[PDB]
Amino acid sequence: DYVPDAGHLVWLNFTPQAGHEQGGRRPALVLSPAAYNGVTGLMQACPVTSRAKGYPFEVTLPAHLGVSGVVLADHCRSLDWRSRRAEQLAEAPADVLAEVRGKLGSLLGM
Amino acid sequence: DYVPDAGHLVWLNFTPQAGHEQGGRRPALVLSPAAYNGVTGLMQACPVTSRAKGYPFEVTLPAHLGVSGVVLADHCRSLDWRSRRAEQLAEAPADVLAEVRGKLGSLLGM
């Protein structure tokens, strides 16, 4: 009965995807709250990749979480987290969630 | 040489998708700016349906844009717009963009 909540890092399959969208099973930083995620079966989450290109939209995860890679803030997507088999991994610190949101917000024109 | 820009309504294939994610070929409201869209080949956009479910995160498109329906603000996702074959259709008015952004921002925890 796990419902991802905002700030959770979950393992999720980003496949299926198209083109340059992130694919593959990897952590994902959940941005939407569990109340939405649980009522819809969807969530907004950003994939984490170990193939960091060092660009500013990549938000690094503190080593303490045990989740390698960077959050690709700009790659946030509406995801069916049951279909994509979300599995809880960890919880990101508030500052990572704030940085990802600020960067994604700038991308979305907020 | 079209690069989608923020506020554009484009026709796009939301397939491939998983599960409850919005699929199908339909309009999309682009939120991210062309500078990003053109450098990455990705964009953040929300799907449009001409058949509203009647929920608050739908944002109705005004008449006379030649694209009708509602923008599903909560279904925004990072999309490879070349893979999904974005075709420019129209430009949404600033108030639609702002309402979509405000709704999506609430979803994303901003």
Residue numbers in the entry:
A (entry chain B), B (entry chain A): 4 to 113
Please quote the paper that reports this structure.
A type II toxin-antitoxin (TA) system that responds to DNA damage stress was identified in D. radiodurans, comprising the toxin MazF-dr and the antitoxin MazE-dr. In addition to the well-established DNA repair systems and antioxidation activities, a type II TA system, the MazEF-dr system, is found to promote dell death through the endoribonuclease activity of the MazF toxin in response to DNA damage in D. radiodurans. MazF-dr protein displayed cleavage preference for the RNA substrate, that is, at the nucleotide prior to the conserved ACA sequence with the order U > A > G > C. By searching the NCBI Reference Sequence Database, not all the Deinococcus species contain the MazEF system, indicating that presence of MazEF is not likely to be a byproduct of natural selection of environmental stressors but caused by the horizontal gene transfer events. MazF proteins usually form homodimers, and the substrate RNA-binding site of the MazF protein is located near the dimeric interface, which undergoes a conformational change upon high-affinity binding of the MazE antitoxin protein.
